[PDB]
Symmetry: C3
Subunit: 89 residues, 3 copies
Amino acid sequence: TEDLKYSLERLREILERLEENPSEKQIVEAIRAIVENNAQIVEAIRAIVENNAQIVENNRAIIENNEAIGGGTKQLEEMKKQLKDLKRS
Amino acid sequence: TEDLKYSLERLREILERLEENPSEKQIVEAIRAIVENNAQIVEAIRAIVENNAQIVENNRAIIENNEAIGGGTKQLEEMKKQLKDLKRS
Amino acid sequence: TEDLKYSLERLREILERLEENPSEKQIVEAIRAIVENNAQIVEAIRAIVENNAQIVENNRAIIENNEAIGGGTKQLEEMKKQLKDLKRS
Ligand SMILES: [Br-]
Ligand SMILES: [Br-]
C-alpha cells in the first residue's frame, strides 16, 4: 500500500513537468506512468479480494459457534430440569 | 478480478503501439482505454465496499456470542454451587 | 465511494471534449484528471485496507470463543457425569 502511494507520487512529479513545458514524449511518459500505477492498483485490489476470503471463513465459524452455543444452552436447561425434578425426590 | 486483469492487458498493448509509433489518435485511444480501466477499478472498489458490510455483521454476531457464552458460564457456576451445596444435604 | 463515481464521471466528461476536438491542452487536462482520479482510488484502497484490520480482530475473537465453548462443553460433561454418579449413589 506504500508502493501505491509512491507510484502516485512519481506520477504527480511527471505531471508537474508536463504542465510546465508540454511535450509529446512527456505525454507518453505520463501515460506509461499511469499504466504502471494502474497495474499496482490492480495488484492491490487482487490482494484485497484474496484476503477478503477470510470474511467467509469467519462467517462459517460464527455460524458453527451459534450452533454449539445452542446445544450447550439446551443441555444446561435440561440439567436444571433434572435437578429441580430430582431435588423434589 | 479477471475483467480487471484483462483491461490492464489491453492497456499494455495500446501503450505498446503508442511507444512504437507515437500519434495523436493513439494518445487519445490510450486515454480512452485508461478511462475504461478506471471505470472497472471503481466498480471493483464498489463491490469490495459492498461486500465488506459483512465484516460489520460478523462483529455484531461475535459480540452476541460473547454475551451468550458469558451467560452460559455464569449458569454453570451457579449450577456447580447448587450441586456442591446439595452434597452437604 | 461517491467521490470515486463523480471523479470518474468528470473524467468521462473531459474525454468527450477530447474526442470531440483533440487538443494538447485537453490531452494534458485529461491526464491531470486521470491523476486526481487515481489519487482518490488510492485513498479508497487505503481505507479498505485499514478497515480490513477488523477481519483479523474478528478472527481472533472467534478463536477465543471457540476455546470458551470448548471449556464450557467440558465442564458440562463433567457435571453430567457427576450427577449420574450421585443419582446412582
Ligand atoms: Br470478518
Ligand atoms: Br463467535
